[PDB]
Amino acid sequence: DIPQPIRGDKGATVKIPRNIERDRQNPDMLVPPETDHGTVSNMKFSFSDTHNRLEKGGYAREVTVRELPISENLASVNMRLKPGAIRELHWHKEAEWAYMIYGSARVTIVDEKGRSFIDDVGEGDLWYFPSGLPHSIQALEEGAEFLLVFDDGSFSSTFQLTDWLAHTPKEVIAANFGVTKEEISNLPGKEKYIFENQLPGSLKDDIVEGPNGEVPYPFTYRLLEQEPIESEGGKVYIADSTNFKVSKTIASALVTVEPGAMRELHWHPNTHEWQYYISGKARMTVFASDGHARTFNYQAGDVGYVPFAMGHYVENIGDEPLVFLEIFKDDHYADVSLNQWLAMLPETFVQAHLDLGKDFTDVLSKEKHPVVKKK
Amino acid sequence: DIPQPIRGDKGATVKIPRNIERDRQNPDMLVPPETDHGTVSNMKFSFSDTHNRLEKGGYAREVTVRELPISENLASVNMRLKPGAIRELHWHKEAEWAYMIYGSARVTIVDEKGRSFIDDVGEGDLWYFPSGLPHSIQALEEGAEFLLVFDDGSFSSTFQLTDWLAHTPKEVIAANFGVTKEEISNLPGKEKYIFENQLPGSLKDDIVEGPNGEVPYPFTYRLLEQEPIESEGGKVYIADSTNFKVSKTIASALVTVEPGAMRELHWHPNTHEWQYYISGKARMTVFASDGHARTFNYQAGDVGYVPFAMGHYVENIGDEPLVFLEIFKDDHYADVSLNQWLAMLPETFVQAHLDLGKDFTDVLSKEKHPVVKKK
Amino acid sequence: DIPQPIRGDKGATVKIPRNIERDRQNPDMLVPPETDHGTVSNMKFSFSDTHNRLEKGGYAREVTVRELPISENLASVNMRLKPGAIRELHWHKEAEWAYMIYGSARVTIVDEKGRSFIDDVGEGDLWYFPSGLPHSIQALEEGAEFLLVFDDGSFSSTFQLTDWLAHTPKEVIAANFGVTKEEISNLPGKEKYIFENQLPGSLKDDIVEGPNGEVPYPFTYRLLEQEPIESEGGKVYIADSTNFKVSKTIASALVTVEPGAMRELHWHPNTHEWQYYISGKARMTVFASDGHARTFNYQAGDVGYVPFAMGHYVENIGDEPLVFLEIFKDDHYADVSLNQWLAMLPETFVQAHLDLGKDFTDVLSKEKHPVVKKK
Amino acid sequence: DIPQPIRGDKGATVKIPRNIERDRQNPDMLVPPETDHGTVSNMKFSFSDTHNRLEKGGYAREVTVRELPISENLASVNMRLKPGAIRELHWHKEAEWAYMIYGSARVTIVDEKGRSFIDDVGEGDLWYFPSGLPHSIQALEEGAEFLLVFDDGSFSSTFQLTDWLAHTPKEVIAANFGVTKEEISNLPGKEKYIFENQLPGSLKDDIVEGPNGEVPYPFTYRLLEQEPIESEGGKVYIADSTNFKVSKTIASALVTVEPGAMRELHWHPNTHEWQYYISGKARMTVFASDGHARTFNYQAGDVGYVPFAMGHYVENIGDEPLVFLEIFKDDHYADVSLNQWLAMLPETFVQAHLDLGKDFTDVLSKEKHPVVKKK
Amino acid sequence: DIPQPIRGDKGATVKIPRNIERDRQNPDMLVPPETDHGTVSNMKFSFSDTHNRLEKGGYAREVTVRELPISENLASVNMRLKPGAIRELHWHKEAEWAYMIYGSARVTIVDEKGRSFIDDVGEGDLWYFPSGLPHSIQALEEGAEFLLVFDDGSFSSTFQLTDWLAHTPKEVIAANFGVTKEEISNLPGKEKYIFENQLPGSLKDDIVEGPNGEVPYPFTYRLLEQEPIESEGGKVYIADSTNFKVSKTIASALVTVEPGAMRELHWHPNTHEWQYYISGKARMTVFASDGHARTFNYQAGDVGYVPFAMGHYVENIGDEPLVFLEIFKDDHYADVSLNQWLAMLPETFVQAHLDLGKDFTDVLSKEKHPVVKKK
Ligand SMILES: [Cl-]
Ligand SMILES: [Cl-]
Ligand SMILES: [Cl-]
Ligand SMILES: [Cl-]
Ligand SMILES: [Cl-]
Ligand SMILES: [Mn+2]
Ligand SMILES: [Mn+2]
Ligand SMILES: [Mn+2]
Ligand SMILES: [Mn+2]
Ligand SMILES: [Mn+2]
Ligand SMILES: [Mn+2]
Ligand SMILES: [Mn+2]
Ligand SMILES: [Mn+2]
Ligand SMILES: [Mn+2]
Ligand SMILES: [Mn+2]
């Protein structure tokens, strides 16, 4: 049907030409809760509203501070590789965190002591590459599609192996390696970035031994192999520097919310939250203090954000599971639950605040249930 | 059908959950021209992706620098009023320009010499209110829906008459007017902002005479009553400070592009362009120098932007007329046409640049045709 | 009498209308030391020159970067609560440090693991609440008046429990707790902030047990129960992260200077100093390098500041004890004493600098005496 | 010989490896005047210390805010073209001012009304291109070497005709001009920037007539054909918006100072001065207030700067004429002469300031002599 | 001879007056590698292009962000002291690192616990003074010349002992020490900064004992007494916080490159590199990503810079050893070698990137050789 911005005796029909498909995606923005108030920055952006860079072997598109200006500290790329296709050997200033949504890939990294790590990553697995350490990605037989998160919102360029070489004098490259200019005459004249290639062999045949030893901590993590926090309406899997040891600047949670359930009312006492919606449909109200609150809708492909310590919840508003990531630029994950907070205070003190009685304080739980199901 | 980000042997199918409706709206973003290159800021945002403020009497939603960070100098509100409904008497730091898309409204303004101007505005008419001059809007019998543009991208609050009074000591208000506190006890305790009211009478019965004379220049302009620049594929109506005399800080063009036509390749030598798409479907490539270019799609409800002097065109990609506004924070409208530029140079000099011959330079026109039709 | 800005043959009588009471408070500003020189930022502001927010149950007033722009990293609130009155359950981005000047209060805090801490605080006691951890204050039978310091100078709003709830959809609150909308219909429609309430019972009856254990470190500290550094002219009590373990971002000293005594010539090698004058009258010269120095006067109710590493002293210029706080945004307190510095160098090297002899270097002490008494 | 940083009993021999050739170029920096004092920003940079971009047809090198950070508002390019060589048709945000040091060139410009201007420029002639108006340069039979000044210090890229076309979809270019894609298949795939070409014919055969009329004001100026201000030690030729009418944002003076002469003590009351040293050797002291002053040396190829209203002089310290440009981002040239200032005051008032008598005030001149010769 | 900016069929002779001596110093800037491309900030500045502050006892000159704006985090002073001459007792906000290029000096430092450290430093030795800790330098019988590096690029003033005292009221100084105003009447009226003095006695006779114990870590380091990393073409000596324990904010390497050798292709994965060229002649290309690269020349007296993670090499282009320092604002030194990186990957994966075969991958070394010699 044709939604209208009308809530009781407020609002009016739209009389100008309009985008009905977007209005249908944003029911809580066309018709917000009457409890929303005040100016709040935009906290929502879709990867579908970005330019897609197409290459022989896949694609990449990005959501940065140039698209979502509230997110100054975190930026993201949605990258797709065809079977065997390679994301060229490269490095950058930013640390990189990744979640494998579809397929599988082989990654390489070499550290500043010349120690190498090569591993395969499947659906639900993570990687984290510390700032400036060079790495590559190669999709295996299914291809691969993954979300990358960088710990600077201004992320724009990366340093590519073949770009460096194409911009270094040939006589210097030749001197660097002890070869003649003729022996390196076939070097590419420009970057590859993403390129097609044959499927690699078995992981065990790729492992490179060297004089400098094994890396002290792995750069990949099997998130979905861990035991989640399970509550009535869903599951939360947390990876931060306490369990995924190398992941110093990114803390993460994968949240699944069943139909009829919600990520409970909470905030993060440490830093801003950046969100990616893998599947399903949500709404979230962000409470910004001083009587300011604004509700946003999200679905698969959307990036969201919750500035440091703002109150929020994430409600599944669809008939399928809602699956999303909560990402923090910090060495740990932390939340304060509204329910648990109030449960741990004297009941008459809580009653004095809320103008409610024992029938309310009796429902509070001292145990944290990150995802709750509607009764 | 199901679009895919594939262009020849580049790109791949989407393997993750996705937003198919948005992908269908953005065909030149999911599959950009092969001529696009490099990092370019986002130049596109939809009013449908904003929170709608609903009141008794209408609604308002906004696109500001908090949504579209490239647009630091210009922000916009889409406001709707029901019949008789009033946008409360108010003022702000920003100058305000307006285009009436639907219906009609009565406006009031009083200047710094105490001179008043009251007028009715219909579809295709403009207003402009200089910074800090207080004004109101009241929809007539059809109601009204209009686009407001403010000459600061950070636009967020306005000063409302009843809010000022509600935050002034009652004894001061009473002293200001020579009345008792009892005589003003019924003042509202909070702002109205938008409120329902009876239809006003005839314009002529509202005109207020005073000791200070007539305003020197009218604050409204009948844009669509002017003679447009007519070219093969469409029409352009320009209002800037040379014709709409009070409009010192906003220059504007309403452009109509027939199906199969395009706003020609051009740039603006004076300042940034802010766009609103009233109806139809477009694509535009923004050329940013140094080999950077990015293509965007637009449709009804979208805001666009073209930073100062960047090369661009606007192509109708639908079967209905494309109608949009070009807005500039300047005292005049100016463009340089690629066609006219090259037509006014020696033909062999142009040939030396383009590696093309007389058969090309023969097609160039010394006359500017802002909108061209495909052959 | 009537002070005049005259120092020997410099200065002149004031010939315009003037503020004689303020001139009397600022004798070293109306008539500075002849050793002052150059442009130095303002380092002084009075709480009496701020707006006082009055509520049922007390008041609060603040000195922020909007009042004292040199203090970009630290801001402060002077808050007063009547007996039993409650500062509403709330949180904020900033860490909070506090000094109880008058009376006593009960505080609550619940951490990110759901562990609670409830304690009573009396005169001379501190609290510290880490960023984002929710807390409350309730005055006991004497009421309470305390100084709060926040580790951001831009401090302006806090997140209040009842404000969050008033801006969350009722259906979401009901879903969050497993109750009906009817059971929460009496929730307040706006924040309380400060509110009157009955005196609480004994502390031991308020302690809440829970499944998550005791907090690892207490959030309160009995500063005046510690052994001070005692020197001839006064006492210094230091609390930083080395003794008050949770106090990671605020280091503090309470200094008492007897009449005729002075906080010695020193600087802080770690960070800026923020000052609050609890009682008495002072002057301080701030030495800013490159021959710049400016003298300021302070008395009860004043905030002062000393930018990172600037040389200074604090002289009691009255007949009662001078009592003030030195606050640092750091994990430790550190000072370098001019006396001790020179005492620890070879005497002829010091003599070569100062153009003075053994009779001077003989007075230097290798032991640090933070507060010295005039002979 | 080997200069040393020694001035009387101050300074010492250099004991580390050093750059003797640069020390010889900077005698007043290795051994400054004893009257210099305090921290002053760098006001000097050489084009020889910049990367030279070499192309088929010439070269270009630049001094921007990235080289000389004091100069935030003005940047410069030294460009050289071989005979017939073309600086490709282009535009940019910045206004452009130029001085032809060597040879001659033909310029084209087309304005926003489609009016064209084509002219030849020889040694000592200027051009000025308003922001965003497209233009080209083509060297004639001698080739050409010129200094360009842009009215933004951040100047980095320009919009090139063939770059725009190479980044526009071929179907759009074809639609724009009413030609087929096949007819434009030979368009260059990348920019030309600077390219070789045959010498053009006579100027009169290039003039393009059109329907839109003559430009109202010429874009070139014959500076050295004007009557200079002639004083005892040299000559000054001024071009600003009062005589070179289009030159709205750049005011300029070409100064020649004979051996033994100096540009007198003066300042500019309007804005910052940017300098280019065409030939000879200079020193200048910049007086920055508050007892700060620093002396710099300049020679051919150097850029200098004098921030707004700072006191200065320019002394010829060589045996050939010193020739330099003074450039201002303003609509006029203005200076205050120290001599003329004091000459226009009562002599006893001047004597009271300087502690000198009639024998000094008797030498002052009420007439301004910008360049004075040593007696 | 007379160099010209000509590379094959690109470039042209210089036709304007020019700086031939600087052009001869910058052969790779007048004629860059054809592989250079795009806008890159200036990464080079000479101490010879700075004002030299001359005093009785020596000199000091500086390169700060005001000279080299890319270097926002690090600034440097070249200071020279005559025999016995003293750099006055002082402190500052910035941490200070030093390298003794010529001669020897005695340093003093007293920490925040009143512990003193006095030591002699010779050629090749370092010091590091933590922020705000007061210190002095006194040259011994050879005099001294050293490079100081400060961990803020805005470095401008320091706090001097005698300046502090000259700007403190005499009555306060007298009260601080328990002396009369008459006993301190001979204090200097202004700073000394650098001053002549008799040679000190033996180090052992200067050591000051005190009640507070020995400093836990020494403030000097004998860099050239350590075992260097020795490779075919040179030597690298590293001092960071892992070996020079107090040096928390500065990591450093002294690199020696024999004629015909080069510091290999590498980057730093942690932070920006600041360079000082002690002796010899170099070129370096900085690779900035996205196809941007620019080559710079350096010789004795030059400061260089390499922004975080940019690719680079340093080639000796002279007939003597090239000796330079690499400085980082970090707690450790780290590099990634291009050679070692590729050696630690599967050979066919490397071949797939570079379009080269086994004859290339066979030359790669798993061991890092920071300095390589040409074959
Ligand atoms: Cl990437
Ligand atoms: Cl409005
Ligand atoms: Cl508060
Ligand atoms: Cl150019
Ligand atoms: Cl120094
Ligand atoms: Mn990466
Ligand atoms: Mn969350
Ligand atoms: Mn308005
Ligand atoms: Mn346009
Ligand atoms: Mn608080
Ligand atoms: Mn202090
Ligand atoms: Mn140009
Ligand atoms: Mn001048
Ligand atoms: Mn120092
Ligand atoms: Mn390096």
Swiss-Prot record, chains A, B, C, D, E:
Catalytic activity, reaction form: oxalate + H(+) = formate + CO2
CDD domains named among the record's database cross-references: cupin_OxDC_C, cupin_OxDC_N
Gene3D superfamilies: Jelly Rolls
Keyword Cytoplasm attached: yes
Outcome following mutation: Y333F: Leads to a 13-fold reduction of CO(2) production
Protein role: Converts oxalate to formate and CO(2) in an O(2)-dependent reaction. Can also catalyze minor side reactions: oxalate oxidation to produce H(2)O(2), and oxalate-dependent, H(2)O(2)-independent dye oxidations.
Residue ranges crossing the lipid bilayer per the database entry: none
PANTHER family (UniProt xref): OXALATE-BINDING PROTEIN, SLL1358 PROTEIN
Protein name as annotated: Oxalate decarboxylase OxdC
Domain Cupin type-1: start-end pairs: 45-185, 221-362
Location of the region described as Disordered in the Swiss-Prot/TrEMBL record: 19-42
Organism in which the protein naturally occurs: Bacillus subtilis (strain 168)
Lineage start: Bacteria, Bacillati, Bacillota, Bacilli, Bacillales
Annotated catalytic residues: E326 (proton donor)
